[PDB]
């Protein structure tokens, strides 16, 4: 029955950018004009919907008393919050709030959080914190880091611990066990559900809140579809109900996100169009028309100057650019143009409180780029400047002193500072995962344009969006409820299917078809067959669409068993999970990447070949080496310490030297090259951990030493020959380079006094601190008691003694170690095991009993390496020596069953 | 060995299997933009309407003043996108009568009359725009205005300087009779037989 599909035919190659609509119909007073090289499309400020005659902003004194403590500072509620306080607090329905961005969607999430918090009230006390958990899935990580602060302020009176899922998997399961509001990205929560670190607390998860669920349209869409198909499938199997609250932007196919979330379209579905936006924004779209890109860049700079000067003295402007260098570049560019046309004094009139606060805040400033602009109205805000200086920009812009803030996108996620005018300059970000300059996402544009209009002062937002003209219709469909939310799951369908195979959620192709029916792809394939490669002939011949789900499951499973992720027989349709499958699911690496690591990982790989096997990952299949950076790459290739076998105009050499230039902390210069480096290292964490797990599972001891060291070198951003005191980030780097200059072994520092250390480094001031940090460094003392069980097996009882002072600020709740027992050649791991040294049980011996095999050429030793899973140069090797080992005799063979004729009882 | 030669590159597209002939054509359009034969060969190589549409969109972005590329890109679209693209075709190829005639076929009467008016303003020396105006007039509800067009036709075409053929005009009447507008062919054949007594 099964027919193999063309799985890359059916995908949408634009990704987050695909327009399902052909037409984009605008509001009424929404003219367009071809000015000079650009077409300007105005869309006026939508008048808000006149209030229903029996609908009012209820105060917080009408919502129930357990929820009144969360709304501090709030007298009334929003209109959107007043429309569904009854569906978020009185009803346990799954919700889909499709509101405009900035229209108070996080207080709706707080209402659902207060309903689930208000089921544990504990009459004399306040909150029974440990019977429930609430997941808040927000798309960007800085949005998560500010939602942690917001929900930590609002739920402070309940004692509810809000935290962000970060760190390694042990840190994440400890943070899940410790906290109630778990704010995370979809990818972090999905990698926890794949690795399994929430399995003990999924009966405690009673509410997941999917902030910005129009990320279903993004290339990060399959993560959210996998998360919600997994949660809805566990609701239909395990029958413990979780409440799903999808917050969205007002975009089409919202009824399909409602059917996707199991939202009943009567009780749970709430669609507020852009009239319900609180500060109604007049949105301008400059689509630059001409076809020579340097004239397009000059026209873009002329347009940001003209639209700055349109709101010169009247309003604040928040310009949004793509790069951190571009922030200061176009701040100084519009400042040089305002100084050129003598319009610089329009921002700062002699409002001497304002310009004097700006002048004395400029002269206090440490940022020499921000000090150039702050005497005038201008300022910059990227994530690269200081926390003090960027919160200086935040507080100087919230007090209407900074007339023009220029920023990257991260401010739009990280801070709720809204301006009157926002001006998104360019819409072109260099995405290294595509390896090219692609358009800004739906998420980033909707969040940048939620900052238009501040809810206190402004009666009307103003959002200018300077684009290419061919990309004008995308953003017109996006910001005017006309860009449909379409599933991108066919891009990542074998990876999500492998995650369901690894978790055991699907076993045969029928359960995989059942799981695919819970995805957003199934509802979008049902509602729009033509867009997803289905004819209406096929929907009339398959109305529930089961043969297309069998074809998708069969095609994804052929991609899985071709890449050796799943043992898939076409006879019965059953899946068997491979350990490569577990590693690819646990570390999110694609099926082509584990096929690369299955072909390329040999036991005999050096450190040279390991960077090459890493660099041939299919995560970097779009990384190309451009010629404009090749010169800089040569200046890296003569300085990186691991040699590269490739030539530098091959991309694998670029990924190789970018990883090595990251670990070496070489300062890079090209923006494309720094972006490719940041991408390959944020992938290199999981990719090197997946190589380490493949290599550890197959038992290769030299390569697992190399790969675990390279995991810790990518994570700690230092080479392992550097001092281990760089993993304590609290030291001065000058005394650490004085330690590396005086190159003795690091284990020499243990035997010295705090005087003796300080005079060996010639730093007697630093000596006590170096002693404290060398005794904070993890150091296990191993002792072995080996007992020959048979001739073939020994029982090793390894006592692990922590010889380091535990400190919660450097070690945390636990220190993870690997116990690797390997032969004389140290090339076969005979026994590896994970060892959690928990913080309750430091300073006492751990008995780890295991059994190692012993083979007929009786080895002189085994080696027990107890290495840290996280810390560089934290390794204790212990030679289990077999010199005086008297093995037992090879035991006599058992007595055979002589085939006696069977004994009757008369015998 | 011979870059900047369109016929060698077309031979190279024609002798490969099509999927590596796509890379051959990509080499050719790196070597030779503004080259419409390579782009129509790129269109014929891909065997799906979406990819042919994208390739001819890139082709029209490269060289926009070629009537063959507009003919190749219009034949893939369905009539509303086809007339939207044909309006830009006759805006970019204003001296090509075939795009004007296909557009006036592709539009409503109050728009087709403006389009044929603009085609006669750009291209006065054509006789197919006049017979297409007759076919448009008879094709919709009017019927007596048709002879008023043709008598206005052969006037201005004798005022510009093209003689009437007695072969091409009766061929226009014959293809009109094969196109179901016999009353326009009647008056056209009357004038053509009149201007070409017992002999």
């Amino acid at each position: 029955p099964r027919q193999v599909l063309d799985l890359e035919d059916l995908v949408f190659t634009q990704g987050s950018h695909f327009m399902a609509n052909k037409r984009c119909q605008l509001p009424d007073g929404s003219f367009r004009r071809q000015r000079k090289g650009y077409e300007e499309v105005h869309v006026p400020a939508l008048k808000p919907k006149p209030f229903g005659s029996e609908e009012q902003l209820l105060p917080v004194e009408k919502l129930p008393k357990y929820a009144q403590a969360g709304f501090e500072g709030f007298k009334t509620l929003n209109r959107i919050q007043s429309k569904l306080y009854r569906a978020a607090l009185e009803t346990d329905e799954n919700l889909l709030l499709c509101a405009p961005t900035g229209a108070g969607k996080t207080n709706v999430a707080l209402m659902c959080m207060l309903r689930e918090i208000g089921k544990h009230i504990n009459m004399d006390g306040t909150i029974n914190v440990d019977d429930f958990k609430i997941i808040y899935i927000a798309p960007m990580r800085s949005l998560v880091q500010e939602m942690v602060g917001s929900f930590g302020k609002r739920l402070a009176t309940y004692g509810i611990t809000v935290a962000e899922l970060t760190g390694d998997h042990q840190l994440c399961k400890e943070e899940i066990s410790a906290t109630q509001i778990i704010v995370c990205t979809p990818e972090k929560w999905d990698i926890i559900t794949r690795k399994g670190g929430e399995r003990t607390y999924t009966q405690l998860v009673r509410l997941i809140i999917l902030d910005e669920i129009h990320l279903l349209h993004d290339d990060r869409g399959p993560v959210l579809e996998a998360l919600v198909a997994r949660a809805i499938r566990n609701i239909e199997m395990t029958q413990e109900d979780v409440r799903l609250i999808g917050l969205s932007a007002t975009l089409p196919n919202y009824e399909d996100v409602a059917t996707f979330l199991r939202v009943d379209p009567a009780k749970g579905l709430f669609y507020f169009d852009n009239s319900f936006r609180p500060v109604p924004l007049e949105q301008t779209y400059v689509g630059i028309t001409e076809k020579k890109a340097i004239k397009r860049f000059q026209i873009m700079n002329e347009i940001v100057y003209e639209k700055i000067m349109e709101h010169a003295g009247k309003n604040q402007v928040l310009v949004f650019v793509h790069s951190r260098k571009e922030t200061g570049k176009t701040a100084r560019a519009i400042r040089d143009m305002c100084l050129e046309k003598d319009t610089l004094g329009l921002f700062l009139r002699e409002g001497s409180a304002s310009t004097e606060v700006l002048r004395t805040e400029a002269e206090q400033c440490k940022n020499l780029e921000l000090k150039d602009l702050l005497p005038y109205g201008f300022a910059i805000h990227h994530a690269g400047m200081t926390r003090v200086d960027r919160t200086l920009v935040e507080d100087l812009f919230a007090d209407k002193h900074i007339q023009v803030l220029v920023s990257t996108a991260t401010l739009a996620w990280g801070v709720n500072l809204p301006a009157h005018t926002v001006i998104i300059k360019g819409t072109q970000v260099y995405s290294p995962e595509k390896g090219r300059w692609t358009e800004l996402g739906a998420l980033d544009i909707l969040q940048m344009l939620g900052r238009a209009g501040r809810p206190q002062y402004d009666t009307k937002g103003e959002g200018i969006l300077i684009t290419s003209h061919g990309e004008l219709q995308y953003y017109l469909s996006l910001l005017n409820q006309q860009l449909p939310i379409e599933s991108q799951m066919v891009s990542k369908l074998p990876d999500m299917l492998n995650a369901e195979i690894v978790l055991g959620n699907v076993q045969n192709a029928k359960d995989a078809v059942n799981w695919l029916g819970y995805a957003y792809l199934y509802i979008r394939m049902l509602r729009s067959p033509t867009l997803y490669g289905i004819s209406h002939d096929d929907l009339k011949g398959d109305p529930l669409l089961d043969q297309r789900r069998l074809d998708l499951v069969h095609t994804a499973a052929l991609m899985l068993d071709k890449n050796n992720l799943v043992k898939y027989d076409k006879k019965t349709g059953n899946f068997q999970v491979t350990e490569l499958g577990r590693i690819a699911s646990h570390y999110y690496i694609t099926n082509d990447t584990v096929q690369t690591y299955n072909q390329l990982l040999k036991p005999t790989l050096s450190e040279i070949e390991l960077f090459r096997v890493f660099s041939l990952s299919s995560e970097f299949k779009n990384i190309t080496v451009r010629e404009e950076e090749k010169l800089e790459l040569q200046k890296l290739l003569e300085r990186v310490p691991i040699p590269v076998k490739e030539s530098i105009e091959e991309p694998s050499a670029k990924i190789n030297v970018l990883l090595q230039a990251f670990i070496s902390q070489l300062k890079l210069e090209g923006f494309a090259l720094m972006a490719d480096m940041v991408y390959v290292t944020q992938s290199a964490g999981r990719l090197m951990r997946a190589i380490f797990e493949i290599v550890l599972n197959r038992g290769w001891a030299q390569l697992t030493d190399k790969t675990l060291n390279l995991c810790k070198m990518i994570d700690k951003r230092m080479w392992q020959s550097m001092c281990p005191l760089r993993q304590f980030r609290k030291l001065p780097e000058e005394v650490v380079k004085k330690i590396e200059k005086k190159n003795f072994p690091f284990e020499r520092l243990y035997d010295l006094n705090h005087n003796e250390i300080g005079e060996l480094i010639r730093m007697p001031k630093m000596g006590k601190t170096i002693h404290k940090y060398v005794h904070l460094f993890p150091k296990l003392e191993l002792s072995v008691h080996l007992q020959p069980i048979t001739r073939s097996t020994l029982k090793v009882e390894l006592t692990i003694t922590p010889d380091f002072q535990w400190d919660e600020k450097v070690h945390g709740s636990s220190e993870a170690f690997w116990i690797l027992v390997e032969d004389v050649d140290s090339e076969v791991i005979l026994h590896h095991e994970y060892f959690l040294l928990k913080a309750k049980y430091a300073q006492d011996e751990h008995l780890i009993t295991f059994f190692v095999p012993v083979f007929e050429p009786l080895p002189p030793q085994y080696f027990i390496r107890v290495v840290s899973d996280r810390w560089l140069s934290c390794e204790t090797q212990l030679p289990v020596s077999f010199r005086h080992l008297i093995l037992p005799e090879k035991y006599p063979p058992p007595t055979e069953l002589l085939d006696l004729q069977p004994l009757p009882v008369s015998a | 060995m011979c870059p900047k030669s369109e016929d060698v590159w077309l031979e190279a597209a024609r002798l490969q299997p099509g999927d590596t002939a796509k890379a051959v054509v990509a080499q050719a359009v790196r070597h030779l933009p503004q080259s419409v034969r390579i782009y129509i060969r790129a269109a014929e190589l891909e065997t799906d309407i979406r990819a042919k549409k994208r390739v001819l969109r890139k082709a029209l972005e490269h060289v926009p003043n070629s009537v063959r590329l507009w003919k190749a890109a219009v034949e893939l679209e369905e009539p509303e996108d086809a007339r939207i693209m044909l309006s830009r075709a006759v805006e970019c190829c204003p001296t090509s009568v075939e795009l004007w005639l296909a557009l006036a076929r592709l539009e409503t009467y109050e728009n087709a009359r403006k389009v044929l008016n603009k085609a006669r303003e750009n291209i006065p020396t054509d006789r197919h725009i006049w017979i297409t105006a007759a076919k448009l007039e008879e094709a919709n509800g009017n019927t007596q205005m048709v002879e008023k067009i043709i008598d206005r036709a052969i006037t201005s075409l004798r005022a510009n300087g093209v003689e009437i053929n007695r072969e091409q005009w009766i061929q226009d009447a014959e293809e009109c009779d094969r196109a179901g507008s016999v009353a326009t062919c009647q008056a056209v054949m009357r004038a053509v037989i009149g201007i070409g007594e017992e002999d």
């Binding site: 037409r23 003209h469 061919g470 | 309006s87 970019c92």
Partner: peptide, 26 residues
């Protein structure tokens, strides 16, 4: 009302564009 269209905007960004005010029907 202003209706944006994929084919219409692609054909708008082609060409010369003083020439978009030709062949009326615009």
């Amino acid at each position: 009302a202003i209706v944006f269209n994929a084919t219409s905007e692609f054909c708008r960004t082609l060409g010369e564009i003083p020439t978009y005010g030709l062949a009326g029907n615009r």
